[PDB]
Amino acid sequence: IQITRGDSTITSQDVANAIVAYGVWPHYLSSKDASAIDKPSQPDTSSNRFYTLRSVTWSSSSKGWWWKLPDALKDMGIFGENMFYHYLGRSGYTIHVQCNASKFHQGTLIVALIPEHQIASALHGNVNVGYNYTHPGETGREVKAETRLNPDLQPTEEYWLNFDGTLLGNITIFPHQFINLRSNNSATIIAPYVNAVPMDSMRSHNNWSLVIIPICPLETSSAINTIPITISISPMCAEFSGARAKRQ
Amino acid sequence: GLPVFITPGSGQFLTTDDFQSPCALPWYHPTKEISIPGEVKNLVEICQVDSLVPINNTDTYINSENMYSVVLQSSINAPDKIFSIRTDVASQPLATTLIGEISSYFTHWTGSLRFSFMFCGTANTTVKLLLAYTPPGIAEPTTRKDAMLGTHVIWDVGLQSTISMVVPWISASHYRNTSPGRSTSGYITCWYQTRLVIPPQTPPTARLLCFVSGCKDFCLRMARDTNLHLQSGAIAQ
Amino acid sequence: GLPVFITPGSGQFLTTDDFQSPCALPWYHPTKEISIPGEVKNLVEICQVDSLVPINNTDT
Amino acid sequence: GLPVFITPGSGQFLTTDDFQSPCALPWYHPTKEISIPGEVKNLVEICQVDSLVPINNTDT
Amino acid sequence: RDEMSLESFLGRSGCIHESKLEVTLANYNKENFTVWAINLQEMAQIRRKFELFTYTRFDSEITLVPCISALSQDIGHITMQYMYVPPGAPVPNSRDDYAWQSGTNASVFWQHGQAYPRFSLPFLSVASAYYMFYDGYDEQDQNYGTANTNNMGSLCSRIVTEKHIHKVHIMTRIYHKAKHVKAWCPRPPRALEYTRAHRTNFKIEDRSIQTAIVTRPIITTA
Amino acid sequence: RDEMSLESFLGRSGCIHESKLEVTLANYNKENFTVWAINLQEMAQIRRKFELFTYTRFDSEITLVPCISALSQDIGHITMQYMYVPPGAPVPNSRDDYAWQSGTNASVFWQHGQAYPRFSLPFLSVASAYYMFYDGYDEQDQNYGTANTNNMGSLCSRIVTEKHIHKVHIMTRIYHKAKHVKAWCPRPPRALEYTRAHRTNFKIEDRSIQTAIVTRPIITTA
Amino acid sequence: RDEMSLESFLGRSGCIHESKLEVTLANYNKENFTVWAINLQEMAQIRRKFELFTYTRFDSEITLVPCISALSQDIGHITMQYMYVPPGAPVPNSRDDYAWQSGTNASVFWQHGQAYPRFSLPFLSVASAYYMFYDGYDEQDQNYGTANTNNMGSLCSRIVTEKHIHKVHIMTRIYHKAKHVKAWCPRPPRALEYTRAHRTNFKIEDRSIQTAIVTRPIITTA
């Protein structure tokens, strides 16, 4: 089947065998939890549609990829603008990861959505991760062997340590889904807003972090020996506050 | 006023006591609580989450995602026995898994564990694996036959990429010590009932994953300090 | 008499504590209270009073 | 708070006393009890058991 | 499963900080006072336990265990003043700073032979929970990881007596106990040594990454 | 708004007076006793808070924190006598004055190793409230500002022991706490340094008037 | 028959262990800490009483009686730390081992002049009772007699103070009391001297077997 949401519509979503992060469905901020007493209203279905990032290439040597939300969507039409022209904001998402392969391809991905995924820096000593590298945008972050710049600002490349000192394989404690090519070829996660406060500065704080690690290497005898992984994200109950003048 | 008699123990500071104490900020009204998704109330919640077992914990794959999978062959000359692991929650490789880690934080455990397997092969790759459990007391099987003579499962991969089997609780005492035993521990052995069968133009090998979690009856008692984490560093601020 | 167990913290003087204490002048009956206009009960009362903002805070 | 008067004997440790004391393992839930045959509840039970008298207690 | 409740796992008391104070003769004020920013991340064992969750909320119980040691010349009777400075309030920076007599702060006086001091603190943050992890940045876009709402205040201590000071050492073990605990979003357990406070950094110089996973020669033999 | 109640704002305890007493060998009586006229206007911080209102009424809680310091020669055990002399009653003027044994006064004996002394005082004035300000004069038309009905009595202290005196120093911090507080007619907050007790005087010699208002270069830029 | 109840016979408190600790100057850590594996079989009188049954179950009450002795140079004030390490938990092996500040263990601090420390322990075994006798073997088929489920933990003690240490001796009598006692399968009373712990061995080298039976010259004369 196909999930048409807004002016966007993604085919191949099918049935609803997706995971709902922590069992809580994305909801609008209730007045009881609200920060400034209550706001008259915040109903806007304008930012609620599907933004499909460029498909990443999964090769026989791919070690992993990760994106951070809301960061990844900072440049996605309405949502992007909204979060740029507002001081505070909160949002849930419906991440949809799917890859095209055949019955002659084999491989497995772990698609996990990690809350407050605080990355660890690459080097030893008194170093820390720099702003630019945890905010790669929709491009995401690919695990590479090549040497990079402001090295002491760079985050770790140890994917098997979840990029934060924990063991991959325990990463299943977070809302996730496995993508076993011979069984399924897509996964879906519906996550609500998660933070210790009602809303926040989307610019400085990334609530969720989408991680994708190939637990079982991709193998195939096809001419081109790589397949694409397509990611579609859709904001859920997005709300904003402290709007500022735009086009100024 | 009121005649009182002081009891042995008064004025002592027992680190495990439970008494009231004056509030240092009696007037301060703490920030209200809001609804944060995912509240945990019992560690058992964490123990019932399947986590990958570093089944292939050899020096070759030690610090890579390859330590979590076993490679199945399609060639007729691969040894019948694939892999083997002890069933005690605290023994390697289980130790470093979710349930293993939480278990290492206690001294007594009890209950059944649930092993799940996932075939990371191709959609046209088929095979029959023999998953067998060996109760504590006897040494792990050495031949496919011995293995199937005990409790086991002939899992036919084609058409079902997953399967789970429950290891029961077999013990003299109700709870057993959290520390790994050899003669008091069970075994999970995996055998080739048939090798990997595949059509033409297909990867000759496929990976196998292994998960583990506790059941409803799983439980821990008498907390101690985990030994899976030894801190001998600065922790400089 | 009555078995008691002393709790950690006894005898300490916590500057933010709240306990009773013997009256030094138990017999003295304090002057009655009269109706003085303008009783304040909460500081919020003071915060809701408009006051001039020194908007032109320059050296001049 | 509550006026108390300390009685002679307070703080003493009488080896035959009987007072409560804080549990060092308050969270630990002890192993359940099972039915073991032959529970003894009073020493009189042992005294009512005929036993042989070493009637011929000579050096031989 | 009662002992597997958060209250049982995190609610146990542990020594979160060791505080040593030494009598110095040169200047009366000197740096005789000791100031410590409350932080439960200093002890690895305690840290790993809490870092098992993303967000936690709880009240606190501080217990103080003073250990006086007199090298010589008696000086047996000395009065200690432990003070708690709330988040945001100014901390003392001299043994006679005004902070020590301020009423907004909480102080407890202890003279040897007295029961160990003890007091409680309510949930301090301006947020609804303490952040065990923070995928965010500072307002200056720096010092990413640490959260400002997480501030819990400071524990201070000064010797109150005056001249009876004969160069004596004071050790004060600070025991903290999380009460009425609540936690959210469990995370995998820390697998490597900690290297920094408020950072998941794990790489150590000239040393190989070492996990808890023990390797075996062959996988067919358990 | 519970923490914004008068009880919360003024009802906190603070050190209203530091009282030092030193053993003097020349004469037994000397000036060993110490007398202090209770006054909550001595500490600027505390003063400014109360001076936020015109009239206040409340009961008091006095807590005493004795700090003994022995230079040498032991003298460890000494008995202290703190005495409260009501408004209008004669104050002692010798360490052995009769006042010390009078029954109309209140005394509390403290020997080291004992819990800190503490007692309460009811609203003392002959008027219905204490004057924080007074646009009036004396009966002699002098000493304008101060109010006689505001008298709260005196806190006295003497070393009771006799010859075990080996020149030891005694520090006694006096903590006061306003209970069941009531206030009338709020006034603007004090904007300048205090210079006199019982006077709103603010002009200081050879120094410019300095407010809390910070100046900026231009008003178009915040 | 109330005094003939198990509670009366086994429920009395007795000194199960004497623990001596001496200040040693060479190394701060040294072996200043003392560790003792709880065992009620060390005292013959107490042992024979319990060995009157095959299986017993009960809770415990530990009371500590510290006896400090100062050879010279004062050092009057010292703080003691007694710690209970549960069965299976790692025991300390240095005066500054981490075990001393761990929260899974139970510790009680005692400074002279304080009431004697005291705390309770629940039934510790993983079995439903403690074995007074065991006709079984180890997993290695060795050390027959002793039972592993019978482990009760360890009592540890360390001097907490630092340098005020002037070579002083510390004696700590440990009193235990079985509460809520239950026993099963009565056995005949021990008739010979004990020679080993956890073994019914009775043969002593170069000494004849001696019973409580007193011999008489002729059986016709009582």
Summed up, what is this model?
This is part of a larger assembly, with one copy of chain A (248 residues), three copies of chain B and three copies of chain E (222 residues). Chain A is mainly β.
Helix content of chain E: under 10%
Structural class of chain B: mainly beta
Structural class of chain E: mainly beta
The beta-strand count of chain E equals 9
Radius of gyration of CA atoms of chain B, rounded to a whole number: 24 Å
Function (chain B): Forms an icosahedral capsid of pseudo T=3 symmetry with capsid proteins VP2 and VP3. The capsid is 300 Angstroms in diameter, composed of 60 copies of each capsid protein and enclosing the viral positive strand RNA genome.
Organism (chain B): Human rhinovirus 2 (HRV-2)
Subcellular location (chain B): Virion; Host cytoplasm
Protein name (chain B): Capsid protein VP3
State the main characteristics.
part of a larger assembly, 7 chains, B: 237 residues, mainly beta, Jelly Rolls, 31% strand, E: Jelly Rolls, four-stranded antiparallel beta sheet, 2 helices, 9 strands, 5% helix, globular
